[PDB]
Design a protein around this ligand. Structure first.
Ligand SMILES: Cc1nnc(-c2nc(C)n3ccc(Nc4nccc(-c5cc(CN(C)C)n(C)n5)n4)cc23)o1
Length: 268
């Protein structure tokens, strides 16, 4: 859990920045090899510790692995490096990525979310900006800062007091402050829309309240250019208003798995 600061080398240039503080590239002296790492630096401590406590429990290829934690000048969260960075920024910069490759990447996210659902953990921040690329064909889910381990007796997490990424939030999140794997299914639909729109922001030019008003009228975002009908139908199904009728990640993953192999064998 706790790492040796003497074994950690941080780069001067920062990878990203936000509410948290900063993300910097580094190197950690492992068992015999040296491991390139992404380091979240705080510069709040309870939120970093809880985030590390969640990541310490997760074991899946489609989730970012935590190496450990370190207390130096600031509190640090050391993670395995996903070199190509956020999915949204990647697709904005690489607008010629094929449709089959986008299906492949969103399917990876669904396999990691299928795992999270089975482990009864709610992500609560599932967006294309929180998907990181190891390769152009290898996605991992990151950002477990809002993530919760569900109580043994509850299928949801109830938030006590409402910043919230409302454009990604299911109606029950807005209306009842209730966060479940099925609300993560809603966010995954928005994620699918972003990926097929090549990292474009959802509900362009709209306020949070205007989004709520639009969803309340039964209106949904349209089909992105070049997005197959089958993929847009899945997005719409993730956008089922009623939580009970909305599919779970095992059904979402199966839909995507089958479609991907249908496209794969069709290309041959
Ligand atoms: C903003 C922003 N945040 N990250 C970037 C960013 N930009 C480029 C070009 N990157 C390249 C590699 C990379 N690797 C990488 N690996 C493992 C973990 C992480 C990572 C990043 C975050 C922060 N979240 C807000 C995403 N956490 C919690 N974990 N990051 C990140 C990155 O931009």
């Amino acid at each position: 859990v706790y790492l040796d600061r003497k074994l950690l080398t941080l780069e001067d240039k920062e990878l990203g920045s936000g509410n948290f503080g900063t993300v910097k590239k580094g190197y950690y002296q492992m068992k015999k090899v040296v491991k390139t790492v992404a380091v979240k630096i705080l510069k709040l401590k309870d939120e970093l510790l809880a985030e590390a406590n969640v990541m310490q429990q997760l074991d899946n290829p489609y989730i970012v692995r935590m190496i450990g934690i370190c207390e130096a000048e600031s509190w640090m969260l050391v993670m395995e490096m996903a070199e190509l960075g956020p999915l949204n920024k990647y697709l904005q910069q690489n607008r010629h990525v094929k449709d089959k490759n986008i299906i492949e990447l969103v399917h990876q996210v669904s396999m990691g979310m299928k795992y999270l659902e089975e482990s009864n953990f709610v992500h609560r921040d599932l967006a294309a900006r929180n998907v990181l690329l190891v390769t152009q064909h290898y996605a991992k889910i990151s950002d477990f800062g809002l993530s919760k381990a569900l109580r043994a007796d509850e299928n949801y997490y109830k938030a006590q007091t409402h910043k919230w990424p409302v454009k990604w939030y299911a109606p029950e999140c807005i209306n009842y402050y209730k966060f479940s794997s099925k609300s993560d299914v809603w966010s995954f639909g928005v994620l699918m829309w972003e990926a097929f729109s090549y990292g474009q922001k959802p509900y362009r030019g709209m306020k949070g309240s205007e989004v709520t008003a639009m969803l309340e009228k039964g209106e949904r975002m349209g089909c992105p250019a070049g997005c197959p009908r089958e993929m847009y139908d899945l997005m719409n199904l993730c956008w089922t208003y009623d939580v009970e009728n909305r599919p779970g990640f095992a059904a979402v993953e199966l839909r995507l798995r089958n479609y991907y192999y249908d496209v794969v064998n069709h290309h041959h």
